[PDB]
Amino acid sequence: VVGGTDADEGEWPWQVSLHALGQGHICGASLISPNWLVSAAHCYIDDRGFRYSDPTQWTAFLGLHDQSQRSAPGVQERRLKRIISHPFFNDFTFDYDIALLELEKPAEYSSMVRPICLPDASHVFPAGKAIWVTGWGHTQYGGTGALILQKGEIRVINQTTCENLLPQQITPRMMCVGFLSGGVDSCQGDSGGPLSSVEADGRIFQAGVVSWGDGCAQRNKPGVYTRLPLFRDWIKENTGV
Numbered sequence: 273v274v275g276g277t278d279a280d281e282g283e284w285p286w287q288v289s290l291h292a293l294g295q296g297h298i299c300g301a302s303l304i305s306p307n308w309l310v311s312a313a314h315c316y317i318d319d320r321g322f323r324y325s326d327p328t329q330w331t332a333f334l335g336l337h338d339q340s341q342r343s344a345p346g347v348q349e350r351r352l353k354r355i356i357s358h359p360f361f362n363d364f365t366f367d368y369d370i371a372l373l374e375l376e377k378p379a380e381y382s383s384m385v386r387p388i389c390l391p392d393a394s395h396v397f398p399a400g401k402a403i404w405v406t407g408w409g410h411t412q413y414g415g416t417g418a419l420i421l422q423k424g425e426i427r428v429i430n431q432t433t434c435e436n437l438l439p440q441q442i443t444p445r446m447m448c449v450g451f452l453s454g455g456v457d458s459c460q461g462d463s464g465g466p467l468s469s470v471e472a473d474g475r476i477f478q479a480g481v482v483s484w485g486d487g488c489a490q491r492n493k494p495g496v497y498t499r500l501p502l503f504r505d506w507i508k509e510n511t512g513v
């Protein structure tokens with residue numbers, strides 16, 4: 273996260289860190305139920321030297337604050353039993369950039385570990401609304417990962433503006449969130465984590481999945497996010513959640 277601040281301990285108890293074996297933090301995820309996480313499909317693709325698509329290659333850390341303190345009280349470590357990448361995920365465009373990850377054993381809910389609420393299919397997160405992005409990703413483009421979970425406030429951008437800023441690249445599954453002036457943005461390694469939106473009675477719903485962007489916190493290059501409401505039914509069908 274570029275231009276954000278340190279989160280307080282347990283401020284985002286749905287924020288999860290995914291570590292690939294021997295590689296440390298790779299992607300974010302969100303806790304949606306005792307057994308299920310949401311993340312971005314593009315985190316779980318194989319490359320010539322590592323099988324990121326293999327579930328047994330991962331460890332999820334729940335209630336994590338500091339990447340250097342993975343053994344802190346209240347941190348829970350979990351293996352994965354399954355990765356379901358969206359069937360329409362497109363490695364070239366990042367259309368349908370969403371995966372569901374099945375924890376090998378259920379999470380234990382606690383003051384540090386708690387699911388984010390999921391929005392109904394018909395809910396719209398309107399243009400201009402403030403929402404939060406969180407992660408351990410780069411705090412500058414080309415820069416280094418944050419030890420301490422970062423938070424930053426960004427705003428939903430009108431879809432037409434979004435398509436125009438990033439010609440031939442924005443599909444209706446995607447949503448621009450951040451500022452045309454830059455400054456606050458997610459970045460490499462925040463990918464897969466949630467947008468948190470404070471709703472009418474203060475409960476936090478997931479407004480998107482961190483997906484991609486052109487550098488980070490660049491003028492006229494806001495962060496692009498996989499939408500959540502469009503996937504409510506797909507999540508129910510696959511998870512029971």
Ligand SMILES: N=C(N)c1ccc(Oc2ccc(NS(=O)(=O)c3ccc(F)cc3)c(Oc3ccc(C(=N)N)cc3)n2)cc1
Nearest residue numbers: 315364365366458459460461463483484485487488495496
């Ligand atoms: N098809 C496209 N339009 C497109 C797709 C991806 C892309 O950039 C990527 C690619 C991989 C990454 N992803 S990631 O964390 O770095 C990653 C990369 C490779 C891998 F194998 C696993 C995980 C990425 O990260 C972000 C996310 C958000 C922002 C932002 N809000 N400014 C910036 C970077 N960004 C840029 C463009």
